[PDB]
Each structure stands twice: as structure tokens, then as C-alpha cells.
Amino acid sequence: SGLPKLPVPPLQQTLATYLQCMRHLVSEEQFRKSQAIVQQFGAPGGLGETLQQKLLERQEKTANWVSEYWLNDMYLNNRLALPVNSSPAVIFARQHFPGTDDQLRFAASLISGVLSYKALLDSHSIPTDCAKGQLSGQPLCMKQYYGLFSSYRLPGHTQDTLVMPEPEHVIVACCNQFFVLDVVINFRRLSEGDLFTQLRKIVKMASNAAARLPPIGLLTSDGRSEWAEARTVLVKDSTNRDSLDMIERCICLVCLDAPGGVELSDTHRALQLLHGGGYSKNGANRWYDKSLQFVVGRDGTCGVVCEHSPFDGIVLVQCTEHLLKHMPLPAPRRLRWKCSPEIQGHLASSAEKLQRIVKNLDFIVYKFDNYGKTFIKKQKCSPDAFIQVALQLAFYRLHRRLVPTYESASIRRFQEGRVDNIRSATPEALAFVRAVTDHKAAVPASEKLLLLKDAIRAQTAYTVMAITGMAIDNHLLALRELARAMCAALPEMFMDETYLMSNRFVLSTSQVPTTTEMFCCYGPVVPNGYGACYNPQPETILFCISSFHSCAATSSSKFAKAVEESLIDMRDLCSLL
Ligand SMILES: CC(=O)CSCCNC(=O)CCNC(=O)[C@H](O)C(C)(C)COP(=O)(O)OP(=O)(O)OC[C@H]1O[C@@H](n2cnc3c(N)ncnc32)[C@H](O)[C@@H]1OP(=O)(O)O
């Protein structure tokens, strides 16, 4: 690989940055105890320097010293059910399908797009991406592509595990029934015309009452430990091993959803993609372990549910946008399943667990249309920095406090680079939000403007630092797991209540820009948090906001309102004179 290896930040740089990031997010007392804790950990000849030495060694022996640690910490270790908690959804524009054939024609074409896109992939014919935005021109890592269709996430009791065959095939799910659709014989990739024909056969078969099998997919929408256990039960029978193996070895799935009941709003269409609406809608017409699940609903609701561990939103969207821009026949096989009274019980639990997730998701698509990048650029500001500050102002004006915030910073500059964290809850953002919201202080508007720019200055400074591998989250993560390898009892540095708080991201954000008329979204990462995915355009900014109804403190409608208001105030501050 001609790409640089992810840098190893100097120990003292990270420890200083660490403390600086949290000072204003914890009490004075607690902060004093942490300074002391950090001081000892980072003292000369201390424990910190010892771990750093191990890290430099690991760096030299590996391609990317955090891939393993990060992949397990961020996704494989998480026990929450994938729907909403982990697996994001990309929603395509609304389609219009008068007759079933219009739905199946779409699905056929889409599948042909997948095939040829997998061809370019297999022949490394895909053009190597370059940076754009913040520090642009350099080559980017492409490894994430080659994870799009070649992955499956196996459940495990405490830790999940991430992952050619012949014939090559896709699994088509209709009416919660799973079918095997071979798409490539001997490098012969079926015609869009024959794929259509095969799909009509599946739809017909999935409508036979005497053959209808139990909704096994439902099992994959359950907590990872629960699915690991129920799968252990299935594995006892040979017929189930077989079908599971088939699902495990497919390219992706193609879900032919039944007509959704509600209105086809952007919000409702997204709900359908995130969780399918529960077991009574399309909630079982899935298999979350698989990487990509392309949805082609009868009514026109389409998109693709994605299993996060193998790749991130940027890569996914380029493939997706490429897919859409592109846009003797044996019968398809139906996967068999041999259920027992055990499985019947498990399907019941999953059904109830999945209903809570659907019942608990408070989601909304907000499109800000007063202005976009263009206006922001006219203020000598980074659109993303501006938007990140906007979100801080929204959280504070609504909740009266700032909280540890997360923002996906892509590090694909380096080998196997995924992402590091940009902590937007800066001290300069606290001073800005306090000046704007504290009426009593009567801070002059000209002063608010200064603080606004200073805030946008710190966000951009952290961003630059994060995308160049000099941030602090991955670094600390690596130091933590190395120490654990030394002794199961972690140092006080990582048992400190301060370190623990810094990682509960009550505000989890990311940017997924797209040229098309599609958008990305996902659930919060903590019970009392928000999920904010935005798409900044020249004149608009699309906000996808999520939170949990279980937390009386959060509200996606109120937060969206608060974002609008924050963007308006900032436009006003910038239009003074
Ligand atoms: C499953 C999922 O979906 C979740 S996974 C997460 C997926 N997303 C990511 O990983 C985020 C990837 N993006 C990055 O890492 C970026 O570096 C981040 C940190 C988001 C920053 O994005 P950027 O593209 O740099 O945005 P930003 O600088 O604000 O805006 C870029 C434009 O804003 C301009 N600009 C920046 N500072 C400016 C300034 N001071 N004055 C005038 N213009 C400025 C840039 O020149 C650029 O112009 P153009 O390309 O539109 O012609």
C-alpha cells in the first residue's frame, strides 16, 4: 500500500488535549482529580510512556494500529440490537409503481447495477478516490468498498465476528420468506430480463400458504447476545445450517416490502428503512447480519439498510449513487427451515423486542431551506464547522448544557483508515452558546459575532487535527486495550469517571453529503442522546434527527426546531455590519 500509516500522536499532546476537552464538562473537583490522575499516568518513566512504546511497536508491526481495537469497540462488541442502534439507512427518492411489474422491473435493474458494480470492483477498475473539503488532493483508502458485498456479521455471546462462492447469488426476501436467486453462472451475469422473470416467480411462490415458513429473519433484529443464542439452537439441524450458510454467502439481499400503511413522507419512508415498522409491516422481511439489504417496496419506498461494521456512509453513498445512475432458467430456491418449540419461543421474544425499538424511535427529517453552503462560504466559514456550531447552540438552548459530542472525521488518508472523533463540544462553543442564550448577560451582538467566529475557528482547528490523525479518541482507545492486555484491571486513567463520561456521546453527529435526492440516517448511541446526520447543499441543509421517546429530556421535533432557530440566529449575527 502506497498510503501513509495512521500516525501515532505524541503522548503528551493527547493527554493535554484530553483534559482541555473535558475541563468544562465536569465539576471543578472532579477535574482536579483527573489532572492528578493524568499527571501520574503521563509522568516520565510512568505507565503511559510504557504503553506508548508498545503502541509504536504495534504501529510498525501492523498496517493500522487501531483497526482491531476500533472495530471491536465501535461495533463488534456492542450488544444492542442492530436496528436503529447501529445499522444506518440510505433512503432513495420516492418511486412510483403502478403495478407489481414496475416494482419488480426496478428491483431487476437495481440487481443488474449491483452485478456490474461488483464487476468493476472485482477487476479493481474503480477509480481511486481523493480528498475533497478539508485538505484535498491526496489518495484515499479504498478497502471499505471491498466490504460492501463480501461481508456478514456473525453474532457471538460477548463479541461478534465480522465474516468466493459458486454459483454467485442474492437472497430475495418477500413476505418474510427467503429465496436464493442465482445471478451469475460461469461469469454469465443474468439478463435484466431474466432477473425480472425470476422475481415474478419468487413473488408468486412467496404467496403460497401451504409453503409459508416462520419469519426467521425476525431473529436477527434482536440483541446480539440473544440472536447468538437462538442461532445456536437453529444450528442443531442440518437444514437450517444450510440456509444460514446460503444467507451468509450471498452478495446482498433484495427486500420486496409490502405496501406500507402510513403516508410516504421522507420521515415515514426512512422509518421503514430503519426498522421496517415492526413485525406487522416489513420488520421481518430482513436479515440484519448481512451488509446490504436493498429495499424495493410495492408502494415505491426504496433504499438500503446497511450493517455498519464493514464500511462507513461515504463509501456506501458513492456506490449507491453509482447504482442509481446506472439505472434454461431454473426456478429460484426457497430456503428451508426446521422450527421447533424452542425457535417458536425465540421468534416471540424477538417480535416483542423489535416492537419496543419501533415504539421507542423518535425520528424526523428536517430540511432547512433558508440557505446553505453558499451563504456560509460567504462568511469565510467552513460549512461543516458552521453546522457543527449550529448543533451546539441547538443542544444548549434546548437543554441548558453542552455534552460530550461525537462527529465522524474520516481518516481514509491512511491505510485501512475508518474514522477518528472530532469533539465539537469545545470551550469556545460553550462561550458562544452562553453569550447567545443568557439574556441577563446582555452580551452585545457584535460580541456574539466574535464568539461565533471564534467557535467556528476552534471547530475547524479540531477538524483539521482529527482528519490528519492527531486527534485523541483512537489514541486513547489503543492505550486502553494495550494496558488491558497487560492486566485485566485498567489503570485509574481509564477507570476515571472523567474518561467514562467523555465517551457517552449524548450528541452523535456526522455528515453524509450526496448529490442525488437520497439521504442517510441512524439512531442515537445512548439512551439519552441524539443522532444527527446532515447533508449540506448549496442552498439547503437536510437534517436527519433521532432520539428515544423513553427519555423525557430529548425530543427530535424540539431539537429540529432548535436547529432552525440556531441557523437563523447565526445568519443574523453574520449580517450585522
Ligand atoms: C453510517 C453513516 O452514514 C455514518 S459514517 C460517517 C460518514 N461521514 C464521514 O465520515 C465524514 C467525512 N467527512 C470528513 O471527514 C470531512 O473532512 C469533515 C470533517 C466532515 C469536513 O467536511 P468538509 O468537506 O471539509 O466540509 P467543509 O470544509 O465545511 O466544506 C467544504 C467546502 O467549504 C469550503 N471552505 C472551507 N472553509 C472555508 C472558508 N473559511 N471560507 C470559504 N470557504 C471555505 C471548502 O473549500 C469546500 O468548498 P467546495 O468543495 O464546496 O467547493
mmCIF file of N, CA, C and O in Angstrom, residues 318-405:
data_model
loop_
_atom_site.group_PDB
_atom_site.id
_atom_site.type_symbol
_atom_site.label_atom_id
_atom_site.label_comp_id
_atom_site.label_asym_id
_atom_site.label_seq_id
_atom_site.Cartn_x
_atom_site.Cartn_y
_atom_site.Cartn_z
ATOM 1 N N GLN A 318 -21.420 6.575 -2.405
ATOM 2 C CA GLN A 318 -20.840 6.664 -3.745
ATOM 3 C C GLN A 318 -21.281 5.454 -4.562
ATOM 4 O O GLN A 318 -21.536 5.559 -5.764
ATOM 5 N N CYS A 319 -21.345 4.305 -3.895
ATOM 6 C CA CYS A 319 -21.757 3.061 -4.525
ATOM 7 C C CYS A 319 -23.227 3.191 -4.870
ATOM 8 O O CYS A 319 -23.653 2.907 -5.986
ATOM 9 N N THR A 320 -23.995 3.633 -3.886
ATOM 10 C CA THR A 320 -25.421 3.813 -4.044
ATOM 11 C C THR A 320 -25.730 4.787 -5.173
ATOM 12 O O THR A 320 -26.530 4.485 -6.055
ATOM 13 N N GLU A 321 -25.103 5.958 -5.159
ATOM 14 C CA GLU A 321 -25.352 6.927 -6.225
ATOM 15 C C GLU A 321 -24.923 6.353 -7.581
ATOM 16 O O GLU A 321 -25.545 6.632 -8.600
ATOM 17 N N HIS A 322 -23.869 5.542 -7.590
ATOM 18 C CA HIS A 322 -23.398 4.937 -8.829
ATOM 19 C C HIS A 322 -24.450 3.933 -9.275
ATOM 20 O O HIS A 322 -24.772 3.840 -10.461
ATOM 21 N N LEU A 323 -24.984 3.180 -8.318
ATOM 22 C CA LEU A 323 -26.010 2.192 -8.626
ATOM 23 C C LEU A 323 -27.160 2.859 -9.369
ATOM 24 O O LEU A 323 -27.500 2.468 -10.485
ATOM 25 N N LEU A 324 -27.747 3.870 -8.743
ATOM 26 C CA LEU A 324 -28.877 4.586 -9.317
ATOM 27 C C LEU A 324 -28.590 5.321 -10.635
ATOM 28 O O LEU A 324 -29.477 5.453 -11.478
ATOM 29 N N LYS A 325 -27.363 5.790 -10.831
ATOM 30 C CA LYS A 325 -27.033 6.477 -12.076
ATOM 31 C C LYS A 325 -27.046 5.446 -13.207
ATOM 32 O O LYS A 325 -27.463 5.736 -14.325
ATOM 33 N N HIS A 326 -26.574 4.242 -12.896
ATOM 34 C CA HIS A 326 -26.534 3.136 -13.843
ATOM 35 C C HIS A 326 -27.960 2.851 -14.317
ATOM 36 O O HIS A 326 -28.192 2.547 -15.488
ATOM 37 N N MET A 327 -28.915 2.970 -13.400
ATOM 38 C CA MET A 327 -30.320 2.725 -13.714
ATOM 39 C C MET A 327 -30.918 3.824 -14.582
ATOM 40 O O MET A 327 -31.538 3.539 -15.605
ATOM 41 N N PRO A 328 -32.456 -21.979 -20.496
ATOM 42 C CA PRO A 328 -32.702 -22.819 -19.317
ATOM 43 C C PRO A 328 -32.655 -21.983 -18.050
ATOM 44 O O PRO A 328 -31.587 -21.776 -17.470
ATOM 45 N N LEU A 329 -33.823 -21.512 -17.624
ATOM 46 C CA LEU A 329 -33.937 -20.666 -16.442
ATOM 47 C C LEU A 329 -34.544 -21.410 -15.247
ATOM 48 O O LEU A 329 -35.746 -21.321 -14.996
ATOM 49 N N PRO A 330 -33.714 -22.149 -14.489
ATOM 50 C CA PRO A 330 -34.224 -22.889 -13.330
ATOM 51 C C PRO A 330 -35.000 -21.947 -12.431
ATOM 52 O O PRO A 330 -34.830 -20.731 -12.506
ATOM 53 N N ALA A 331 -35.849 -22.500 -11.576
ATOM 54 C CA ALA A 331 -36.642 -21.669 -10.674
ATOM 55 C C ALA A 331 -35.848 -21.358 -9.409
ATOM 56 O O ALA A 331 -35.023 -22.164 -8.969
ATOM 57 N N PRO A 332 -36.075 -20.172 -8.816
ATOM 58 C CA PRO A 332 -35.358 -19.793 -7.595
ATOM 59 C C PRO A 332 -35.678 -20.741 -6.431
ATOM 60 O O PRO A 332 -36.806 -21.198 -6.292
ATOM 61 N N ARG A 333 -34.681 -21.039 -5.604
ATOM 62 C CA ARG A 333 -34.860 -21.926 -4.452
ATOM 63 C C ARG A 333 -35.361 -21.202 -3.188
ATOM 64 O O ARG A 333 -34.978 -20.062 -2.916
ATOM 65 N N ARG A 334 -36.215 -21.863 -2.415
ATOM 66 C CA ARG A 334 -36.701 -21.283 -1.171
ATOM 67 C C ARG A 334 -35.897 -21.923 -0.045
ATOM 68 O O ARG A 334 -35.776 -23.147 0.025
ATOM 69 N N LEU A 335 -35.334 -21.106 0.833
ATOM 70 C CA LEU A 335 -34.564 -21.650 1.932
ATOM 71 C C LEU A 335 -35.513 -22.382 2.856
ATOM 72 O O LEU A 335 -36.607 -21.898 3.148
ATOM 73 N N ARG A 336 -35.099 -23.564 3.293
ATOM 74 C CA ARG A 336 -35.906 -24.368 4.197
ATOM 75 C C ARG A 336 -35.528 -24.041 5.626
ATOM 76 O O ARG A 336 -34.417 -23.590 5.899
ATOM 77 N N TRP A 337 -36.457 -24.282 6.541
ATOM 78 C CA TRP A 337 -36.214 -24.046 7.957
ATOM 79 C C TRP A 337 -36.977 -25.126 8.717
ATOM 80 O O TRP A 337 -38.122 -25.427 8.387
ATOM 81 N N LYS A 338 -36.338 -25.731 9.709
ATOM 82 C CA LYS A 338 -37.000 -26.745 10.520
ATOM 83 C C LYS A 338 -37.112 -26.199 11.938
ATOM 84 O O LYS A 338 -36.190 -26.325 12.740
ATOM 85 N N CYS A 339 -38.252 -25.578 12.229
ATOM 86 C CA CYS A 339 -38.507 -24.985 13.540
ATOM 87 C C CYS A 339 -38.896 -26.000 14.595
ATOM 88 O O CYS A 339 -39.376 -27.093 14.285
ATOM 89 N N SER A 340 -38.696 -25.618 15.849
ATOM 90 C CA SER A 340 -39.041 -26.461 16.982
ATOM 91 C C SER A 340 -39.733 -25.566 18.004
ATOM 92 O O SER A 340 -39.801 -24.348 17.824
ATOM 93 N N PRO A 341 -40.270 -26.152 19.083
ATOM 94 C CA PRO A 341 -40.940 -25.315 20.085
ATOM 95 C C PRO A 341 -39.996 -24.259 20.656
ATOM 96 O O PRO A 341 -40.443 -23.225 21.152
ATOM 97 N N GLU A 342 -38.693 -24.529 20.586
ATOM 98 C CA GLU A 342 -37.692 -23.586 21.073
ATOM 99 C C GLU A 342 -37.744 -22.327 20.220
ATOM 100 O O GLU A 342 -38.058 -21.242 20.701
ATOM 101 N N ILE A 343 -37.424 -22.495 18.943
ATOM 102 C CA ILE A 343 -37.412 -21.399 17.982
ATOM 103 C C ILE A 343 -38.692 -20.577 18.051
ATOM 104 O O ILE A 343 -38.656 -19.353 17.941
ATOM 105 N N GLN A 344 -39.819 -21.254 18.233
ATOM 106 C CA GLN A 344 -41.108 -20.578 18.310
ATOM 107 C C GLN A 344 -41.113 -19.560 19.451
ATOM 108 O O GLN A 344 -41.688 -18.475 19.323
ATOM 109 N N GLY A 345 -40.463 -19.918 20.558
ATOM 110 C CA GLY A 345 -40.382 -19.028 21.706
ATOM 111 C C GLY A 345 -39.498 -17.832 21.412
ATOM 112 O O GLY A 345 -39.850 -16.693 21.728
ATOM 113 N N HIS A 346 -38.345 -18.103 20.803
ATOM 114 C CA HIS A 346 -37.376 -17.077 20.422
ATOM 115 C C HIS A 346 -37.959 -16.050 19.450
ATOM 116 O O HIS A 346 -37.731 -14.851 19.599
ATOM 117 N N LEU A 347 -38.699 -16.523 18.452
ATOM 118 C CA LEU A 347 -39.324 -15.630 17.484
ATOM 119 C C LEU A 347 -40.274 -14.699 18.224
ATOM 120 O O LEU A 347 -40.424 -13.530 17.861
ATOM 121 N N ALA A 348 -40.914 -15.222 19.268
ATOM 122 C CA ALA A 348 -41.843 -14.428 20.063
ATOM 123 C C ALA A 348 -41.107 -13.293 20.782
ATOM 124 O O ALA A 348 -41.536 -12.147 20.727
ATOM 125 N N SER A 349 -40.004 -13.609 21.452
ATOM 126 C CA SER A 349 -39.232 -12.584 22.149
ATOM 127 C C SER A 349 -38.776 -11.503 21.189
ATOM 128 O O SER A 349 -38.990 -10.316 21.441
ATOM 129 N N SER A 350 -38.140 -11.926 20.097
ATOM 130 C CA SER A 350 -37.641 -11.007 19.082
ATOM 131 C C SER A 350 -38.759 -10.089 18.617
ATOM 132 O O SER A 350 -38.564 -8.877 18.454
ATOM 133 N N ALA A 351 -39.933 -10.673 18.413
ATOM 134 C CA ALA A 351 -41.084 -9.905 17.974
ATOM 135 C C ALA A 351 -41.358 -8.781 18.971
ATOM 136 O O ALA A 351 -41.564 -7.629 18.585
ATOM 137 N N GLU A 352 -41.349 -9.116 20.257
ATOM 138 C CA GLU A 352 -41.608 -8.125 21.285
ATOM 139 C C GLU A 352 -40.463 -7.142 21.484
ATOM 140 O O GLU A 352 -40.698 -5.982 21.813
ATOM 141 N N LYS A 353 -39.227 -7.605 21.303
ATOM 142 C CA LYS A 353 -38.059 -6.742 21.468
ATOM 143 C C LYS A 353 -38.036 -5.722 20.348
ATOM 144 O O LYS A 353 -37.700 -4.555 20.554
ATOM 145 N N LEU A 354 -38.392 -6.181 19.156
ATOM 146 C CA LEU A 354 -38.385 -5.334 17.982
ATOM 147 C C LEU A 354 -39.510 -4.306 17.988
ATOM 148 O O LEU A 354 -39.390 -3.247 17.367
ATOM 149 N N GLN A 355 -40.594 -4.603 18.704
ATOM 150 C CA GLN A 355 -41.727 -3.680 18.788
ATOM 151 C C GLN A 355 -41.360 -2.497 19.690
ATOM 152 O O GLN A 355 -41.805 -1.362 19.467
ATOM 153 N N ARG A 356 -40.547 -2.766 20.710
ATOM 154 C CA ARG A 356 -40.109 -1.715 21.617
ATOM 155 C C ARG A 356 -39.210 -0.731 20.860
ATOM 156 O O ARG A 356 -39.323 0.487 21.037
ATOM 157 N N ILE A 357 -38.323 -1.258 20.018
ATOM 158 C CA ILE A 357 -37.427 -0.406 19.253
ATOM 159 C C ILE A 357 -38.230 0.492 18.317
ATOM 160 O O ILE A 357 -37.920 1.673 18.160
ATOM 161 N N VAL A 358 -39.262 -0.067 17.696
ATOM 162 C CA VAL A 358 -40.097 0.703 16.779
ATOM 163 C C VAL A 358 -40.904 1.718 17.570
ATOM 164 O O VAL A 358 -41.093 2.857 17.143
ATOM 165 N N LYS A 359 -41.377 1.294 18.732
ATOM 166 C CA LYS A 359 -42.177 2.156 19.583
ATOM 167 C C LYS A 359 -41.335 3.266 20.219
ATOM 168 O O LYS A 359 -41.833 4.364 20.483
ATOM 169 N N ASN A 360 -40.053 2.987 20.444
ATOM 170 C CA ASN A 360 -39.163 3.946 21.088
ATOM 171 C C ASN A 360 -38.430 4.941 20.179
ATOM 172 O O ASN A 360 -37.869 5.923 20.663
ATOM 173 N N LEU A 361 -38.427 4.701 18.875
ATOM 174 C CA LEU A 361 -37.726 5.596 17.968
ATOM 175 C C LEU A 361 -38.475 6.864 17.621
ATOM 176 O O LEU A 361 -39.540 6.821 17.023
ATOM 177 N N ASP A 362 -37.897 7.995 17.998
ATOM 178 C CA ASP A 362 -38.465 9.305 17.701
ATOM 179 C C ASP A 362 -37.572 9.860 16.578
ATOM 180 O O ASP A 362 -36.459 10.347 16.829
ATOM 181 N N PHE A 363 -38.055 9.748 15.337
ATOM 182 C CA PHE A 363 -37.304 10.181 14.153
ATOM 183 C C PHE A 363 -37.973 11.264 13.288
ATOM 184 O O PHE A 363 -39.204 11.311 13.156
ATOM 185 N N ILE A 364 -37.159 12.129 12.688
ATOM 186 C CA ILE A 364 -37.704 13.189 11.857
ATOM 187 C C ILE A 364 -36.712 13.715 10.836
ATOM 188 O O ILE A 364 -35.527 13.856 11.120
ATOM 189 N N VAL A 365 -37.214 14.007 9.641
ATOM 190 C CA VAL A 365 -36.392 14.549 8.562
ATOM 191 C C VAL A 365 -36.689 16.045 8.458
ATOM 192 O O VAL A 365 -37.804 16.437 8.107
ATOM 193 N N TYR A 366 -35.707 16.878 8.796
ATOM 194 C CA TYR A 366 -35.886 18.325 8.726
ATOM 195 C C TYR A 366 -34.991 18.913 7.642
ATOM 196 O O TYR A 366 -33.789 18.669 7.604
ATOM 197 N N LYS A 367 -35.608 19.675 6.749
ATOM 198 C CA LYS A 367 -34.904 20.311 5.650
ATOM 199 C C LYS A 367 -34.926 21.812 5.858
ATOM 200 O O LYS A 367 -35.980 22.439 5.783
ATOM 201 N N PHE A 368 -33.756 22.371 6.140
ATOM 202 C CA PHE A 368 -33.587 23.801 6.360
ATOM 203 C C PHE A 368 -33.394 24.391 4.960
ATOM 204 O O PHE A 368 -32.474 23.986 4.238
ATOM 205 N N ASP A 369 -34.259 25.329 4.571
ATOM 206 C CA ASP A 369 -34.191 25.914 3.233
ATOM 207 C C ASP A 369 -33.891 27.399 3.162
ATOM 208 O O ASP A 369 -33.979 27.989 2.089
ATOM 209 N N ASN A 370 -33.549 28.021 4.281
ATOM 210 C CA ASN A 370 -33.261 29.446 4.234
ATOM 211 C C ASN A 370 -31.953 29.726 3.512
ATOM 212 O O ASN A 370 -31.805 30.767 2.873
ATOM 213 N N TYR A 371 -31.002 28.799 3.626
ATOM 214 C CA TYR A 371 -29.697 28.943 2.977
ATOM 215 C C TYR A 371 -28.853 27.698 3.178
ATOM 216 O O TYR A 371 -29.244 26.785 3.906
ATOM 217 N N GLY A 372 -27.683 27.673 2.545
ATOM 218 C CA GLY A 372 -26.817 26.516 2.662
ATOM 219 C C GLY A 372 -25.342 26.852 2.605
ATOM 220 O O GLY A 372 -24.911 27.903 3.090
ATOM 221 N N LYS A 373 -24.556 25.959 2.010
ATOM 222 C CA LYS A 373 -23.123 26.186 1.919
ATOM 223 C C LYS A 373 -22.809 27.573 1.334
ATOM 224 O O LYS A 373 -22.071 28.355 1.947
ATOM 225 N N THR A 374 -23.385 27.890 0.172
ATOM 226 C CA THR A 374 -23.114 29.170 -0.478
ATOM 227 C C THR A 374 -23.097 30.340 0.497
ATOM 228 O O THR A 374 -22.102 31.058 0.592
ATOM 229 N N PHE A 375 -24.184 30.548 1.225
ATOM 230 C CA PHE A 375 -24.198 31.656 2.171
ATOM 231 C C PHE A 375 -23.073 31.521 3.184
ATOM 232 O O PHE A 375 -22.338 32.481 3.425
ATOM 233 N N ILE A 376 -22.941 30.335 3.780
ATOM 234 C CA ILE A 376 -21.909 30.107 4.792
ATOM 235 C C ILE A 376 -20.516 30.451 4.263
ATOM 236 O O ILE A 376 -19.750 31.150 4.940
ATOM 237 N N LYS A 377 -20.192 29.985 3.055
ATOM 238 C CA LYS A 377 -18.887 30.276 2.461
ATOM 239 C C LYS A 377 -18.659 31.777 2.341
ATOM 240 O O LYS A 377 -17.520 32.243 2.417
ATOM 241 N N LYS A 378 -19.742 32.529 2.148
ATOM 242 C CA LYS A 378 -19.642 33.976 2.019
ATOM 243 C C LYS A 378 -19.281 34.634 3.327
ATOM 244 O O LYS A 378 -19.065 35.838 3.365
ATOM 245 N N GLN A 379 -19.216 33.846 4.395
ATOM 246 C CA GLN A 379 -18.871 34.374 5.712
ATOM 247 C C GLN A 379 -17.449 33.983 6.095
ATOM 248 O O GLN A 379 -17.006 34.239 7.212
ATOM 249 N N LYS A 380 -16.729 33.376 5.154
ATOM 250 C CA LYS A 380 -15.358 32.930 5.408
ATOM 251 C C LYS A 380 -15.398 31.809 6.452
ATOM 252 O O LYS A 380 -14.557 31.738 7.357
ATOM 253 N N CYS A 381 -16.388 30.935 6.313
ATOM 254 C CA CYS A 381 -16.550 29.827 7.233
ATOM 255 C C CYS A 381 -16.652 28.473 6.542
ATOM 256 O O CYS A 381 -17.092 28.367 5.399
ATOM 257 N N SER A 382 -16.211 27.447 7.260
ATOM 258 C CA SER A 382 -16.291 26.065 6.803
ATOM 259 C C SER A 382 -17.754 25.689 7.035
ATOM 260 O O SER A 382 -18.276 25.849 8.139
ATOM 261 N N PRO A 383 -18.454 25.228 5.980
ATOM 262 C CA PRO A 383 -19.865 24.864 6.158
ATOM 263 C C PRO A 383 -20.044 23.863 7.297
ATOM 264 O O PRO A 383 -20.884 24.055 8.182
ATOM 265 N N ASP A 384 -19.234 22.810 7.293
ATOM 266 C CA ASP A 384 -19.341 21.795 8.323
ATOM 267 C C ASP A 384 -19.057 22.332 9.719
ATOM 268 O O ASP A 384 -19.669 21.890 10.690
ATOM 269 N N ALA A 385 -18.114 23.258 9.832
ATOM 270 C CA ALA A 385 -17.801 23.830 11.132
ATOM 271 C C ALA A 385 -19.002 24.652 11.589
ATOM 272 O O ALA A 385 -19.415 24.585 12.748
ATOM 273 N N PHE A 386 -19.554 25.426 10.660
ATOM 274 C CA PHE A 386 -20.695 26.277 10.924
ATOM 275 C C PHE A 386 -21.849 25.410 11.400
ATOM 276 O O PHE A 386 -22.452 25.676 12.440
ATOM 277 N N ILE A 387 -22.155 24.368 10.639
ATOM 278 C CA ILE A 387 -23.244 23.474 11.011
ATOM 279 C C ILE A 387 -22.979 22.803 12.376
ATOM 280 O O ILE A 387 -23.897 22.651 13.179
ATOM 281 N N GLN A 388 -21.735 22.425 12.658
ATOM 282 C CA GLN A 388 -21.437 21.795 13.942
ATOM 283 C C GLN A 388 -21.712 22.759 15.094
ATOM 284 O O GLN A 388 -22.188 22.353 16.164
ATOM 285 N N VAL A 389 -21.398 24.031 14.887
ATOM 286 C CA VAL A 389 -21.637 25.026 15.921
ATOM 287 C C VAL A 389 -23.155 25.172 16.052
ATOM 288 O O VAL A 389 -23.702 25.257 17.158
ATOM 289 N N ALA A 390 -23.834 25.191 14.915
ATOM 290 C CA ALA A 390 -25.283 25.304 14.920
ATOM 291 C C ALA A 390 -25.852 24.269 15.894
ATOM 292 O O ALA A 390 -26.627 24.602 16.795
ATOM 293 N N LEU A 391 -25.449 23.012 15.721
ATOM 294 C CA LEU A 391 -25.930 21.939 16.587
ATOM 295 C C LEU A 391 -25.638 22.194 18.079
ATOM 296 O O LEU A 391 -26.488 21.924 18.927
ATOM 297 N N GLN A 392 -24.461 22.725 18.407
ATOM 298 C CA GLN A 392 -24.135 23.014 19.814
ATOM 299 C C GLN A 392 -25.128 24.027 20.366
ATOM 300 O O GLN A 392 -25.687 23.845 21.443
ATOM 301 N N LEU A 393 -25.356 25.094 19.609
ATOM 302 C CA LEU A 393 -26.287 26.129 20.027
ATOM 303 C C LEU A 393 -27.675 25.514 20.236
ATOM 304 O O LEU A 393 -28.358 25.816 21.215
ATOM 305 N N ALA A 394 -28.087 24.637 19.326
ATOM 306 C CA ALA A 394 -29.384 23.968 19.452
ATOM 307 C C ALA A 394 -29.452 23.135 20.740
ATOM 308 O O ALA A 394 -30.396 23.254 21.512
ATOM 309 N N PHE A 395 -28.452 22.292 20.982
ATOM 310 C CA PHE A 395 -28.493 21.475 22.185
ATOM 311 C C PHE A 395 -28.558 22.329 23.452
ATOM 312 O O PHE A 395 -29.396 22.097 24.321
ATOM 313 N N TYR A 396 -27.685 23.323 23.550
ATOM 314 C CA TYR A 396 -27.643 24.182 24.723
ATOM 315 C C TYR A 396 -28.918 24.987 24.965
ATOM 316 O O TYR A 396 -29.418 25.046 26.098
ATOM 317 N N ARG A 397 -29.443 25.617 23.915
ATOM 318 C CA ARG A 397 -30.642 26.435 24.071
ATOM 319 C C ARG A 397 -31.821 25.572 24.469
ATOM 320 O O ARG A 397 -32.752 26.048 25.110
ATOM 321 N N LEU A 398 -31.775 24.298 24.089
ATOM 322 C CA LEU A 398 -32.852 23.386 24.431
ATOM 323 C C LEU A 398 -32.630 22.758 25.792
ATOM 324 O O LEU A 398 -33.520 22.761 26.635
ATOM 325 N N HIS A 399 -31.425 22.245 26.021
ATOM 326 C CA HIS A 399 -31.133 21.527 27.270
ATOM 327 C C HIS A 399 -30.338 22.232 28.349
ATOM 328 O O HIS A 399 -30.103 21.659 29.402
ATOM 329 N N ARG A 400 -29.911 23.462 28.099
ATOM 330 C CA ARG A 400 -29.166 24.234 29.101
ATOM 331 C C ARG A 400 -27.763 23.718 29.449
ATOM 332 O O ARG A 400 -27.206 24.096 30.479
ATOM 333 N N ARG A 401 -27.186 22.870 28.603
ATOM 334 C CA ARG A 401 -25.841 22.370 28.872
ATOM 335 C C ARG A 401 -25.241 21.779 27.605
ATOM 336 O O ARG A 401 -25.956 21.444 26.667
ATOM 337 N N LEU A 402 -23.920 21.674 27.577
ATOM 338 C CA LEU A 402 -23.268 21.051 26.456
ATOM 339 C C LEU A 402 -22.930 19.676 26.962
ATOM 340 O O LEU A 402 -22.847 19.469 28.176
ATOM 341 N N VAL A 403 -22.738 18.729 26.050
ATOM 342 C CA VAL A 403 -22.404 17.367 26.445
ATOM 343 C C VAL A 403 -21.379 16.820 25.472
ATOM 344 O O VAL A 403 -21.253 17.316 24.353
ATOM 345 N N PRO A 404 -20.630 15.787 25.886
ATOM 346 C CA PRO A 404 -19.624 15.189 25.010
ATOM 347 C C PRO A 404 -20.299 14.901 23.678
ATOM 348 O O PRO A 404 -21.319 14.218 23.629
ATOM 349 N N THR A 405 -19.746 15.434 22.599
ATOM 350 C CA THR A 405 -20.337 15.238 21.286
ATOM 351 C C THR A 405 -19.377 14.497 20.385
ATOM 352 O O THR A 405 -18.161 14.650 20.500
#
